[PDB]
């Protein structure tokens, strides 16, 4: 075993947030638990979350983490006999561009839903007497679109509050920027303050390599012997489902090939439609792994 | 004695970590005591240690050392009559690239071995309600591969814990980096917090120059005068071993020459195989020093 | 080399035996040790083939500080200690400057 | 197989822009998707595109392409482990005569 | 020894790339290891490599080599005690005339294999929204065809990528040119980024002079004393082979002269056909060196 083998470096596991969006929801919104849709695994934002829009490129988004802890020191022990970690405080800050209601509500710690535009559309937003403690649910989701198979990496912060506001500079060659720092708090119902997520087909290519779950070694077609009616109806067509030994649905990632296309027609997705009666073999190919199913068609 | 002779400068003793890898193991792993394999001296990582993969080039890896000490001051003494050094605190930090399970477990102070990928491969990693005190065993091993004889310089830290986490910045032209600072703690069983190691044939060229042990002046062939059977069997072949006065095995670094190749065949590694009966002399040459052995072959 | 590593790790490594293949492991001591050294800093100004040797004698020095060690793939490893001079009673000084 | 067969040079695939015209349209115009007429394959310019007319022969028309990219550098790797190309900037310049 | 003898100038070792071709292959192609056919030493391009066609004569082809290195400076040492060379960057640029699919795919960093010509043959090639990192395998092979014995000088670059595109100028008296700069990258599988090769009978005349291998001093006929049946069959004809002391097959470079043509006929290639039974001598002569063999023909 040489040095390179020991290093076991995986360049594909480096993920770049080529695009990024911040979504805020009012505290009454049900918090997101995952961004992966249970239907097809696509990106699914729960209702109530609204994007803040464009933010400054060069500032980007900075995520902060600090630990406050206390060491229990015993006589004659150079190192603490016990370290008590109180909490982990997560913050994130960014420079928003868009002058929309949710951004301004965040900046001024106020609810502006009752603000009615004037008879010519003008609005005036008064800062409240006392700044209010307003909590939001936050999603920070980024995309690494590589080889047409995107990776969505995201952070879920169910309870965030405005913590700090950077100085706002007006220049005649720049747009106005709002630069809040948001602090994450633990939400009791969901039981965490920050969660990090990975999703997307590009991630599905990497989950086993990243060390989550087990690797894919066998492909299984759950409708092993389906039957499709020649005549039109509910049972005329059948949708296949290809899984693995690790329990991951690999149906989008496989190539569907039929034995006799005339007898039973299968699409790229894997929907088997029986044009004519007979027997057809449907083979799903992904790399060197193969799952084969046989379909009987009746008229 | 001129200035140059007094300086006694050895450029070859300057070692460059041209490549570097960080390996972490769960605290239940048996700690590494050496990276040098007892079989052939090759680099040998104990099971349970896993590389974190690629890390940032420009940041590199920074090793910190802090001494905390107290001085006992006596009346009329400008200098302390006694200095009590409590401990030496060793830290190291680096910027990891790969979104692997072990890296994310380190940064979030959590065990994610029970995290199951969703049907489409997505994972959500929740930060624990309270950060946990998790210890790891760490190996930092670097390679100076020069003249095709590598030097492995390494640090063994049997008990490391996450101490600090640098701010994480998301930029649309960069990958996401994790920048932990790890603090070494004394492991009671192995009896140290940090150990520095050197290994490899390139190091073996330099051990005497570096002042460890004594210099090599004589070469000895430990088998001496063996006998190999012409017929095929367990005792048909004999493996030689070449040592020095300092007790260092120099077998990989010597040139094996046989007197009569037909009588007894010797490879580069020094394995004597008796093709035909007779008397053959096997000479191992390294630089200006040599060792001669005579092998009698019987049929 | 051994003397540099002994200085940085505040340990005596004279008993460290290289392994069968020459490898060595240097463990940091459980408690850092107070180790004193005698130091000579001698420089040379070679001008017109008639050199000048300027030197400092520090009979009792001890490791005082160790700077952060950075590993870069385009540089050699550096050890950056700060040594503090102490008065040696027998010779009666902590620092002497010499010219020869 | 000799060198000439391997080279497989096709002189007829070298195309000389003997005549050239630049047409501009206001942004409200529907963009052209192809210049080939679907009926008989002849040249078909969509409405709204207007030629700028004659331009200087010697200057010709210059087409520029620049890439902006950032290299991700890992420790111990001489070459980047990933190159992020931001965009490809295309420019063209020419010297118009007509007022 | 005079100055002329010391200089030892060999004009025939100067090679002019009178003709030159650039072949590109998709990264999925198996990289070329050599261009010399193992059968008869002729020039052999692996499948998947396609020539870009004609390129501009005056610009030619330019090969660049850049070293990046760092010097380790020690106090009191005017020169570095160690120089760490990171890599050698090889580039090449040339100006292509032909508006082929592979050329346009290269310049636009896109795959155009799915582009379908319209009903009248027209094609539209859209530049991708984001430029893609596409690697190719490259062969630059030139020919010096002098004295009817060609020399093939070539460069193998298994992993090349578009690095730069020069300004494209449209003129009414010139064809349109594409001027890419390609950068060679190290291919892990084959273990290099650039390899330079020499092949051909003209090279074979110069291999010993160029200092590779040893000089040719003896010619040897490997078959020795063969026997051919007069009757037609599989064993009716035997193909000879002439070698040298350096291990180079000199069969194309030798002249076959038979003793009795009626007994055994030998062609220029050295194929021995026994027309009538008897004993014949086959002599292959090259310059002042010769090799003789005797063939016994039976009916």
Name every chain C residue with its beta carbon within 8 A of the beta carbon of E82.
Answer: 76
Distance from CA of B173 to the nearest CA of D (A): 6
Which SS3 state, helix, strand or coil, does residue B273 take?
A: strand
Q: What residues in B contact D86, CB-CB < 8 Å?
A: 173
H-helix or E-strand spanning residue D50: strand D50-51
Cβ contacts (< 8 Å) between E86 and chain C: which residues? 74
Closest by Cα among A185, A146, A196, A145 to A163:
A185
Q: Which phi-psi region, left, alpha or beta, contains residue A245 (left: φ > 0; alpha: ψ -120 to 50)?
A: alpha
DSSP annotation of A71 reads: E
E82·B18 Cβ contact <8 A: no
Query: Mutating which of B24, B50, B121, B141 best tests the A interface, going by the most A Cβ atoms within 10 A?
Result: B121
D87, closest residue in chain B (CA to CA): B173
Nearest residue of A to residue B99, measured between CA atoms: A13
CB contact under 8 A, E81 and B11: yes
Q: Obtained via which technique? A: cryo-EM
List, in order, residues 6 or more apart from B95 with CB less than 8 Å away: B55, B56, B59, B166, B177, B178, B179
By C-alpha distance, which of B101, E47, E299 is closest to A198? B101
Contact residues on chain D for E22, CB-CB shorter than 8 A:
none
E219-234: burial string, b at 16+ Cβ within 10 Å, e else: bebeeeebebebeeee
Q: Which of helix, strand or coil describes residue E156?
A: strand
The H helix count followed by the E strand count for chain C is: 1, 6
- Residue the block writes with tokens 């291998």: E213
Q: Determine contact, residues E219/E247, Cβ cutoff 8 Å.
A: no
Nearest-angstrom CA–CA distance, A271 and A238: 6
Residue D43's DSSP bridge partners are: D36
For testing contact with chain E, the best of C71, C72, C74 (most E CBs within 10 A): C74
Identify the sign of the CA torsion E207, E212, E216, E222.
Answer: negative
Determine if residue E148 is left, alpha or beta; phi over 0 gives left, psi from -120 to 50 gives alpha, anything else beta: left
CA distance A199 to A33: 13
Q: Are A33 and B124 in contact (CB under 8 A)?
A: yes
Q: Which of D36, D61, D88 sits opposite E118 (nearest CB)?
A: D36
Using a CB-CB distance cutoff of 8 angstroms, which residues of chain E are in contact with residue B17? none
Angstrom distance (rounded) from CA A153 to CA B170: 11
Residue D16 CB neighbours (<10 A) = 13
Chain D: partners with 3+ C-beta pairs within 8 Å: A, B, E
Compute the radius of gyration of chain C from its Cα atoms.
17
- If you measure CA to CA, which chain C residue comes closest to B81? C86
Candidates A2, A6, A14, partner chain D, best to mutate (most D CBs within 10 A)? A14
Contact B10 C2 (CB under 8 A): no
CA–CA separation, C2 and B213 (whole Å): 10
Q: How far apart are CA B184 and CA A294, in angstroms?
A: 60
Interface of D with A (CB under 8 A): 72, 74, 76-77, 81-82, 84
For D72, the closest of A7, A9, A14 (CB atoms) is A14
**Closest by CA position to A140, among listed A49, A21, A48:** A21
Q: Which of A45, A26, A287 is nearest to A152 (CA)?
A: A45
Q: How far is B10 from chain E (nearest CA, A)?
A: 9
Cα(E51)–Cα(A167) distance, integer angstroms? 60
Q: Which member of D8, D14, D38 has the closest CB to residue E175?
A: D14
Return the number of other C-beta atoms located less than 10 Å from residue A3's C-beta.
19
Alpha carbon distance E139, E194 (integer Å): 10
Hey, what are E191's tokens?
């273990």
CB contact under 8 A, C74 and E82: no
Per the CB < 8 Å rule, is A11 touching D84? no
Distance CA E143, CA E200 (A): 9
Q: Could you give the C-alpha distances from A299 to A223, A237, B44, in angstroms and in order? A: 20, 13, 66
User: In A, what residues contact D, Cβ < 8 A?
Assistant: 7, 9, 11, 14, 16, 18
Query: Does A17 contact B176 at a Cβ distance shorter than 8 Å?
Result: yes
Q: Shortest Cα distance from A18 to chain B (angstroms)?
A: 4
| Chain centre to alpha carbon of residue E106 | 23
Q: Which residues of A touch D76 (CB under 8 A)?
A: 7
Burial of A290 from C-beta contacts in 10 A (0-12 / 13-18 / 19+): middle
Tell me the C-alpha distance between A198 and A12, whole Å. 14
Q: Which chains touch A (3 or more CB pairs under 8 A)?
A: B, D
Comparing alpha-carbon positions, the chain D residue that sits nearest to B143 is D76
Q: Which residues of E touch C75 (CB under 8 A)?
A: 70, 72, 84
The beta-carbon neighbor of B85 closest among C31, C66, C71 is C31
Residues of E in contact with C76 (CB under 8 A): 72, 82
> Which residues sit directly before a break in chain B (C to N > 2.5 Å)?
none
Tokens coding B250: 């120099």
CA separation for the pair A181, A176 (Å, rounded): 17
> For residue B38, which residues of chain C lie inside 8 Å, CB to CB?
20
A157 phi and psi, to 5 degrees?
A: -125, 95
Which chains border E (3 or more CB–CB pairs < 8 Å)? Answer: B, C, D
Contact between residue C29 and residue C15 where contact means Cβ atoms under 8 Å apart: no
Residues across chain C: 100
Question: Mind telling me how many Å the CA of B264 is from chain A's nearest CA?
Answer: 32
CB neighbours (10 Å) of residue A223? 16
B11 phi, psi to nearest 5 deg: -65, -30
Indicate which of C76, C78, C80 best probes the interface with E, i.e. most E CBs within 10 Å of its own CB: C76
Each residue of A80-93: b (16+ CB within 10 Å) or e? eeeeeeeebbbbbb
Which chains have at least 3 CB atom pairs separated by less than 8 Å from chain C? B, E
Task: State whether residue E125 is helix, strand or coil.
Answer: coil
Measured CA to CA, the distance from residue E219 to residue E253 in angstroms comes to 11
Sequential DSSP letters for D52-94: ---B-TTT-EEEEEEEEEEEE-BTT-SS-SEEEEEEEEEEEE-
In chain E, after which residues does the backbone break, taking C–N over 2.5 angstroms as a break? none
Beta strand segments in A147-270, E: 149-165, 180-184, 195-199, 219-221, 227-229, 237-239, 242-244, 255-258, 265-266
Q: Name all contacts of A286-289 with Cβ < 8 Å and 24+ positions apart.
A: A286/A219, A286/A242, A286/A250, A286/A253, A286/A254, A286/A255, A289/A216, A289/A217, A289/A218, A289/A219
Task: Answer yes or no: do E100 and D60 touch at CB < 8 A.
Answer: no
* H or E segment to which residue B43 belongs: none
Residue B11 tokens, joined: 């450029």
């Amino acid at each position: 075993t040489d040095f390179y083998t020991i290093k076991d470096a995986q360049a594909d596991l480096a993920i770049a947030p080529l695009n990024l969006t911040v979504l805020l929801a009012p505290y009454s919104t049900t918090p997101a638990t995952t961004l992966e849709s249970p239907t097809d695994g696509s990106l699914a934002i729960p209702p109530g979350y609204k994007s803040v829009g464009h933010f400054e490129k060069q500032a980007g988004l900075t995520l902060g983490n600090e630990f406050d802890s206390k060491d229990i020191e015993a006589y004659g022990e150079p190192e603490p006999i016990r370290t008590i970690i109180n909490k982990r405080t997560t913050t994130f800050d960014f420079a928003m561009y868009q002058n929309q209601r949710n951004v301004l509500e965040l900046i001024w710690t106020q609810d502006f839903s009752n603000i009615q535009p004037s008879e010519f559309g003008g609005i005036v937003l008064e800062a409240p007497k006392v700044p209010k403690n307003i909590y939001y649910r936050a999603i920070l989701v980024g995309m690494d679109d590589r080889n047409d198979r995107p990776i969505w990496l995201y952070w879920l912060m169910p309870k965030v509050k405005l913590d700090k506001l950077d100085n706002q500079t007006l220049n005649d060659d720049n747009v106005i920027e709002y630069k809040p720092t948001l602090k994450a708090f633990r939400d009791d119902v969901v039981g965490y303050s920050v969660a990090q997520g990975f999703a997307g087909p590009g991630w599905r290519d990497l989950v086993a390599t990243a060390g989550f779950g087990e690797a894919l070694t066998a492909l299984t077609i759950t409708p092993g012997s389906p039957t499709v009616t020649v005549a039109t109806g509910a049972s005329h067509t059948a949708q296949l489902l290809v899984e693995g030994d690790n329990g991951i649905n690999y149906t989008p990632d496989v190539v569907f090939t039929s034995s006799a296309p005339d007898k039973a027609s299968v699409s790229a997705a894997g929907l088997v439609t029986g044009v004519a009666a007979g027997s057809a073999t449907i083979t799903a190919t992904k790399g060197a792994l193969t799952a084969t199913a046989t379909v009987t068609v009746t008229a």
